[PDB]
């Protein structure tokens, strides 16, 4: 991939966060093969002395007492001299991996979680826009977590993102409405965050605890920490958080029909650890949000489709009525433009173009037609920045920044072309997107950018996007023109 940013093997860094301990066992005897260097902080004896020992000799009695429920269901609460810990089991590189993390301290956590679950699963959740849906998701994640700032971050189609909603405590910086470069979350991280939907950075200023030995002996590379709850994250991201002034970070993947739609991102000014069970309660919330957004969005498309079909039905009724085609198309101009949310339409029915509403002049349309006929499309063609692909009209963003053309005949030049003007857009980036990172001389060590202050950009020469309903309506109009 492109940058060095994509290259970092973030699952193979060999470090865990200092609040927990990791032990990896293999074979029928469960011999300890990999252990974190801090494992005396919970186990009494120096970790290097425990490599190669059977599990029954390294683990405390309190954990061994819970060994059967641990293996059975992969997660158990254990009470140690150092306090209550959550034990977690997964498999990686042929090893059984055991992680221990401080356990939830509030007995009423699940009751509180079930209550905020109600606030989001309730019907009527969305009855002032999906914006109120996102705001409620952010508010309830903040209530359950205690984090200073909770943001809903949506990926655009180039994988840069923007903050759509935000819940933060009074008197605190926010990022609402700002855009962030795709490189802020590089492609291997997005990959990992698609299969591992949660991640906690409990203290952005702490140093990672290394694993011992620093490679798995059979493999000659570090233990694969893809599914580790304790995995220490990229040093470059830790720098990024410090540059933002955040001491703890917790984010959750928003998966909507298989793809990474966005994130719920949380920041705290100070270190803060959330328990495993509290993180899993937060993940229920995000899966509810994904579900509410799908149902709302499909309802919106259906309503839009119904509106287009009503327009088509009225056009059909006006046909099969009086006069010629050009006459009914004259009377029904506003419906024909409304079909695709357009400001003008060129109808090429054989003679000269029929120009309805706001369109470029006849000579320019006939020229556009000559060129569309050569293009490699089948029934529909659309673009929201015509000037990039057809520079003869690149100056005419006022009437022809976007077009939608349907072919009305097989091997002949018969078309309906709808036009849209540009819509200027003011983007506010969190820092200068032209310098998304700060490499050292030589370009071997990368740093995050230093500032996230607003940096404004205006986008010109692009129309509103051609949406699914526009495309469906154009096909319906084609079928009516035969």
Residue 441 interacts with its own copies (CB under 8 A)? no
Among 25, 147, 153, 477, the residue binding ligand EL5 under the rule CB under 6 A is 153
Instruction: Choose which of 97, 100, 263, 289 interacts with ligand EL5 (CB under 6 A).
Output: 263
Determine if 347 is a binding residue for its own copies (CB under 8 A): no
Residue placing its CB nearer to its own copies in the complex, 269 or 284: 284
Q: How far is CA 3 from CA 184, 185, 186, 188, in A?
A: 11, 12, 9, 11
Q: Does 439 bind its own copies (CB under 8 A)?
A: no
Binding letters toward its own copies, positions 455-474, x by CB under 8 A: -----------------x--
- 363 token code pair: 């000579």
Determine whether 161 is exposed, middle or buried from the number of CB atoms within 10 Å of its CB (0-12, 13-18, 19+): buried
Residue (244 or 309) nearer to its own copies, CB: 309
Q: Which is nearer to ligand EL5, 17 or 383 (CB)?
A: 17
Structure tokens at 435: 């310098």
Residue list 58-117, contact with its own copies (CB under 8 A): 107, 110-111, 113-114, 117
Q: Does 163 bind ligand EL5 (CB under 6 A)?
A: yes
Stretch that binds its own copies, among 27-35, 138-146, 218-226, 281-289 (CB under 8 A): 281-289
From the list its own copies, ligand EL5, none, partner contacted by residue 473 (C-beta under 5 to 8 A by kind): none
Q: Identify the residue among 79, 105, 219, 291 touching its own copies (CB under 8 A).
A: 291
Which residue, judged by CB position, is nearest to ligand EL5 in the bound state? 5
Cα–Cα distance, 472 to 482 (Å, whole number) = 16
Q: Which does 4 bind (CB under 5 to 8 A by kind): its own copies, ligand EL5, none?
A: ligand EL5
* Tokens of residue 408, six digits: 């009305």
- 276 counts as binding ligand EL5 under rule CB under 6 A: no
Does the footprint of its own copies cover residue 255 (CB under 8 A)?
yes
446 touches ligand EL5 by CB under 6 A: yes
Peptide bond into 213 cis (omega under 30): yes
* Packing angle of the helix pair 276-318, 468-481 (nearest 10 deg): 20
Q: What does 315 bind: its own copies, ligand EL5, none (CB cut-off 5 to 8 Å by kind)?
A: its own copies
Range 406-445, binding ligand EL5 (CB under 6 A): 437
The phi, psi pair for 224, rounded to 5°, reads -70, 110
Angstrom distance (rounded) from CA 31 to CA 58? 9
Does residue 452 interact with ligand EL5 by CB under 6 A?
no
Q: Which stretch binds its own copies (CB under 8 A): 200-208, 244-252, 305-313, 338-346?
A: 305-313
201 belongs to the binding site for ligand EL5 (CB under 6 A):
yes
The residue among 252 and 408 lying less far from ligand EL5, judged by its C-beta, is 252
Q: 245-272 in b/e burial notation, b at 16+ Cβ within 10 A?
A: ebbbbbbbbbbeeeebbbbbbbbbeeeb
- Partner from ligand EL5, its own copies, none contacting 295, C-beta within 5 to 8 A by type: its own copies
* Residues forming the site for ligand EL5 (CB under 6 A): 3-5, 8, 10, 151, 153, 161, 163, 175, 180, 183-186, 189, 199, 201, 233-234, 236-237, 240, 249, 251, 263, 265, 437, 446, 448
* Residues forming the site for its own copies (CB under 8 A): 107, 110-111, 113-114, 117-118, 121-124, 255, 257-258, 281, 284, 287-288, 290-292, 294-295, 298-299, 301-302, 305, 309, 312-313, 315-317, 319-321, 379, 408-410, 472, 475-476, 478-480, 482
């Amino acid at each position: 991939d492109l940058s060095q940013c994509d290259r970092e093997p973030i699952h193979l860094l060999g470090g865990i966060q200092s609040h927990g301990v990791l032990l990896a066992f293999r074979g029928p005897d469960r011999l300890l093969e990999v252990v974190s260097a801090n494992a005396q902080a919970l186990l009494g004896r120096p970790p290097e002395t425990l490599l190669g020992q059977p599990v029954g000799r390294v683990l405390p009695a309190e954990v061994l007492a819970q060994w059967e429920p641990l293996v059975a269901r992969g997660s158990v609460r254990v009470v140690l001299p150092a306090g209550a810990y959550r034990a977690l089991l997964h498999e990686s590189d042929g090893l059984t991996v055991l992680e221990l993390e401080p356990a939830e301290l509030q007995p009423g956590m699940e009751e509180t979680a079930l209550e905020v679950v109600r606030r989001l699963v309730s019907p009527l959740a969305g009855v002032k826009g999906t914006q109120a849906l996102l705001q409620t998701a952010a508010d309830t994640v903040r209530a359950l977590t205690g984090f200073d700032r909770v943001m809903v971050y949506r990926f655009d189609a180039d994988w840069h993102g923007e903050v759509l909603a935000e819940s933060k405590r009074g008197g605190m910086d926010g990022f609402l409405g700002m855009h962030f470069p795709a490189t802020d979350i590089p492609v291997q991280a997005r990959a990992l965050y698609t299969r591992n939907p949660l991640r906690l950075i409990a203290d952005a200023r702490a140093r990672p605890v290394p694993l011992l030995p620093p490679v798995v002996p059979a493999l000659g590379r570090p233990l694969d920490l893809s599914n580790s709850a304790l995995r220490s994250v990229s040093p470059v991201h830790l720098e990024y958080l410090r540059n933002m002034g955040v001491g703890a970070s917790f984010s959750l993947s928003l998966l909507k029909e298989g793809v990474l739609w966005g994130l719920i991102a949380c920041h705290h000014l100070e270190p803060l650890h959330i328990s495993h069970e509290r993180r899993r309660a937060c993940e229920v919330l995000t899966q509810l949000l994904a579900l509410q957004l799908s149902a709302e969005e499909r309802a919106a498309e259906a309503s839009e489709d119904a509106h287009r079909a009503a327009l088509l039905g009225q056009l059909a009724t006006a046909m099969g009525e009086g006069g010629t085609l050009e006459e009914v198309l004259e009377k029904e101009s506003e419906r024909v433009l409304a079909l695709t949310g357009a400001a003008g339409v060129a109808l090429l029915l054989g003679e000269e173009p029929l120009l309805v509403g706001c369109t470029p002049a006849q000579d320019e349309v006939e020229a556009l037609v000559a060129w569309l006929a050569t293009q490699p499309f089948q029934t529909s063609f659309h673009t929201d920045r015509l000037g990039t692909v057809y520079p003869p009209l690149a100056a005419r963003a006022d009437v022809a920044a976007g077009i939608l053309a349907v072919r009305l005949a097989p091997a002949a030049a018969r078309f309906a072309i709808w036009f849209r003007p540009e819509v200027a857009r003011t983007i506010s980036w969190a820092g200068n997107p032209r310098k998304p990172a700060e490499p050292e001389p030589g370009h071997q060590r990368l740093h995050p950018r230093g500032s996230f202050q607003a940096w404004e950009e205006t986008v010109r020469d692009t129309s509103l996007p051609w949406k699914r309903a526009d495309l469906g309506a154009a096909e319906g109009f084609r079928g009516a023109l035969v």
